[PDB]
Ligand binder design. Structure first.
Ligand SMILES: Nc1ncnc2c1ncn2[C@@H]1O[C@H](COP(=O)(O)OP(=O)(O)O)[C@@H](O)[C@H]1O
Ligand SMILES: Nc1ncnc2c1ncn2[C@@H]1O[C@H](COP(=O)(O)OP(=O)(O)O)[C@@H](O)[C@H]1O
Ligand SMILES: Nc1ncnc2c1ncn2[C@@H]1O[C@H](COP(=O)(O)OP(=O)(O)O)[C@@H](O)[C@H]1O
Ligand SMILES: Nc1ncnc2c1ncn2[C@@H]1O[C@H](COP(=O)(O)OP(=O)(O)O)[C@@H](O)[C@H]1O
Ligand SMILES: Nc1ncnc2c1ncn2[C@@H]1O[C@H](COP(=O)(O)OP(=O)(O)O)[C@@H](O)[C@H]1O
Ligand SMILES: Nc1ncnc2c1ncn2[C@@H]1O[C@H](COP(=O)(O)OP(=O)(O)O)[C@@H](O)[C@H]1O
Ligand SMILES: [Mg+2]
Ligand SMILES: [Mg+2]
Ligand SMILES: [Mg+2]
Ligand SMILES: [Mg+2]
Ligand SMILES: [Mg+2]
Ligand SMILES: [Mg+2]
Lengths: 152, 152, 152, 152, 152, 152
């Protein structure tokens, strides 16, 4: 897919509550990525248990699911070259204490449980997460007039 | 409704294309308003013709509808005291040439046909537009921890 | 006093709680005014009752005093030409609904009771307020290297 | 000329010294205007005396000319619909004390002699000033990919 | 102390003179740390010689003390989990040439002697510096309504 | 030359088209570097072939030259201690995928061909590039009043 690669990002409840949705979106916009889906949702525990299926054996799993179900999240899909890996780099390490200044977590967060945002960790994860959170008809193709200035 | 008043805002295609979605959202966030719904959509001509029903006899109606249907828009609902009138003030006059610096249109736009954003013009318009664009289950009630610092 | 005019500003508890101290300070810094005093304090009811002596007959007086005593404020003195009147303009109208975008209240606030900041309303008020909140030895004289580029 | 209208702007020495060149340029860029010329120069007294010929009888003329010749200025030409009048609005009133917050002078200046920037006051003034400061071969025609999103 | 850990920061004279006090405070605010003390002061040589006691053998010690005593500084205490180590990371390396973009020194400074800010290098250093610069009654306890969104 | 070291930077056509000229200039301004030359130009292929002489055997050379000649660039000279190496660090790695957040390319770009800006790679390169792009009389000496706060 190359430049058509996509990732799933979600602003977590702490990001909404601390009024950082615009700030986060703006960082992906200024980087050059293309927004292809967006909605504010209250995720069910059922969806979240599937979202985090791979973490089912971790001791924080129960609390992570409860937390993510506790308030609104902003679900998003972004498109562009290497968007999965690059998004992860813009977000910064899982634990904000390891995330350098300049990253979202490095600039805005302190603790692993309140780290503002989720990003898919691979192309395959993004495929799964996009399908889980969004119908095909919520993913928009639009002609991106900036593309000429971001890509050869 | 008082502090529960709501308005409908939409970032128009020019706002998406020029990468101002985050910028716009951030201005409503920093003002203190509560985001209660959000989605990126491709609006149909049918929806837009009803959205702009009051302008049906004006000669720009056709091209307004075509333009708004020509690319993705970011549909939003914001909640708070006097949110309809205050949102209109943050956005600025219809014609950007009359919108002072500090407003969205005053800072970011030049011409009336490319003026970035729609806001409801009254509480009754907001009522109609919210129902037209969003189901009840897309409008989220969340406990706003900032509310104590915005309201008495 | 001319360019030596001074005003008293205070970031109110809502400004501290919403993390807008730096934002506010930065607006006075970028304007060209000279910071001559600064401290984070918890104001007593006794001080606040005198600070707001002129409002003693108003129905919001009791609640205003209690609120301002309820949490830390950032007390400040700024110096420069016409600083009292210009600070009031940067802050915006008492009621944020009347404060245009570009002002502190217009950009960041909604309601008259949670309006972020106090500014002296006149040179006489500033005289009184500066004396009430700060000792002479908390007001600092420093050689301002920017002064040649702000003043003729 | 319509959307091909042009104005002459100059960041004055105080704007260079206070490091606000980027800030100012960014405000015209975000507004949608097209940059068609730009250079850092040290203007001669001869040029400045002609630039300000209409102010020759005013008491500040001598000091204005000397000051503008005392350091580098950033000379610019911007193009777009109503750019002369709109530029003046973004800049704000001559005397910064009358320039509201949101404008360049309202946000960044205090005194009439140190007011950061010059803008042409009319289409005829811009014609004269552009010719005086720039050769025809310093004014660049480029295909503006944003134009589709700023104009009908 | 965990989340009650505290560090001492000081904006040095160059930070005040270049008008970066707001900018610096804003970076600590947006990170989530809690401001518990703040004042603008002119530090004595006596205090500064003790502040920098560990550097007494170094060749820049005399000049460092003189410089820090030469103009106002903004003394601060910040509270939060791992605040001492994280503050140092937000500030960046001692020598700004080694401080990456995104850090305060990486974004705003060039030279080791003009590096904007001091931060305690350990919990014990912070304890000592807090006691040296502030009385107990200048350190404020306030109920932090954002804490729920920064900490588990 | 020490603090008199100079580098050549150029905002490439993508930086002009995406409206990031002010943003880029502002980063060099806030760092403390001194702007000593600036112009918007349309570079000839002849000049660009010499500019990029060392890359003549690389497969992108033809397309790089054509691209850089295809639209306006903003040519600049900046002065200060270690400005060549530090500029390169602020810009970030050639390939934006390797450029961390906080850098220009890390924040604003995706692909190596659309990476916003050129910076000299050494003191000798800067010497050559400055002479190639600018006459001696376009390089300005001005007294930098901020220098006392950037340098010891
Ligand atoms: N030790 C922990 N305690 C609490 N929450 C944790 C912990 N480790 C991870 N989490 C949370 O779970 C989320 C998912 O964990 P994981 O998938 O391993 O990391 P990532 O989100 O970086 O892919 C994290 O982003 C974080 O909010
Ligand atoms: N003369 C015009 N030509 C083109 N578009 C127009 C014209 N007048 C208004 N419009 C467009 O129609 C939209 C709706 O018009 P109106 O409802 O009167 O204004 P507003 O959006 O400020 O409530 C405007 O926001 C603008 O984009
Ligand atoms: N009607 C009101 N209800 C609640 N609080 C009010 C009301 N009017 C004023 N206040 C509060 O009292 C403060 C002081 O009032 P006043 O001195 O008249 O205004 P200002 O602060 O603009 O000088 C206001 O800034 C506001 O926070
Ligand atoms: N009384 C004054 N003292 C000092 N400088 C002044 C005075 N009046 C005007 N100036 C300066 O002269 C410039 C040109 O004056 P004028 O052309 O009337 O204003 P404008 O710049 O708004 O077109 C102003 O921008 C200001 O910098
Ligand atoms: N070689 C030097 N020349 C001048 N000043 C220096 C030098 N090295 C360090 N300093 C200054 O002394 C301060 C204290 O030194 P040190 O305690 O090592 O650094 P830090 O502030 O990073 O803990 C530095 O922040 C810097 O301003
Ligand atoms: N593989 C490539 N494909 C396309 N363009 C490239 C490639 N490698 C380099 N370039 C472009 O050519 C410019 C010059 O390359 P080079 O001089 O090696 O890098 P730098 O700009 O870091 O000094 C780069 O900045 C980039 O825009
Ligand atoms: Mg994960
Ligand atoms: Mg309307
Ligand atoms: Mg009052
Ligand atoms: Mg004039
Ligand atoms: Mg130290
Ligand atoms: Mg190179």
């Amino acid at each position: 897919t190359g430049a058509h690669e996509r990732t799933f990002l979600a602003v977590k409840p702490d990001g909404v509550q601390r009024r950082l949705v615009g700030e986060i979106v703006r960082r992906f916009e200024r980087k050059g990525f293309k927004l292809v889906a967006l909605k504010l949702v209250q995720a069910s525990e059922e969806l979240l248990r599937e979202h985090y299926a791979e973490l089912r054996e971790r001791p924080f799993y129960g609390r992570l699911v409860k937390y993510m179900a506790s308030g609104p999240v902003v679900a998003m899909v972004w498109q562009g070259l290497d968007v999965v890996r690059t998004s992860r780099a813009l977000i910064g390490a899982t634990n904000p204490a390891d995330a350098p200044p300049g990253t979202i977590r490095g600039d805005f967060c302190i603790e692993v449980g309140k780290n503002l945002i989720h990003g898919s960790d691979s192309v395959e994860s993004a495929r799964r997460e996009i399908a889980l959170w969004f119908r095909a008809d919520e993913l928009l193709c639009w002609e991106d007039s900036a593309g000429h200035w971001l890509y050869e």
